[PDB]
Design a protein around this ligand. Sequence first.
Ligand SMILES: [Cl-]
Ligand SMILES: [Yb+3]
Ligand SMILES: [Yb+3]
Ligand SMILES: [Yb+3]
Length: 129
Amino acid sequence: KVFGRCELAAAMKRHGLDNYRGYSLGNWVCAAKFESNFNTQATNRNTDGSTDYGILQINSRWWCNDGRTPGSRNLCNIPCSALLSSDITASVNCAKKIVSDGNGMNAWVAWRNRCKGTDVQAWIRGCRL
Ligand SMILES: [Cl-]
Ligand SMILES: [Yb+3]
Ligand SMILES: [Yb+3]
Ligand SMILES: [Yb+3]
């Protein structure tokens, strides 16, 4: 599923991401835009042989099991395929663990490089929240 900007904002809010660990909703929407272009099916292979999955590009080295990443810790206790669902619940629940890991949203390189320090509230402008 390819989400609309406000559609995703609403879905993320419903699943408790607005101000989760102090990160306003716009941060999450901005991260999703540059990680996956709002596409739940996005996958990208990393240089270390791991793969990133879903709307928030969660990595198979640490967070989910894709059956081809030796030494995966599977800390979200889920198959990576579950992160490609049109239902974002699994992605959101796993992202909540990632952002609590100590480095906050810096865990997402696209957030650090493209969202951090910008006017992220723009990403929820015009939406019914
Ligand atoms: Cl933080
Ligand atoms: Yb990425
Ligand atoms: Yb990556
Ligand atoms: Yb409201």
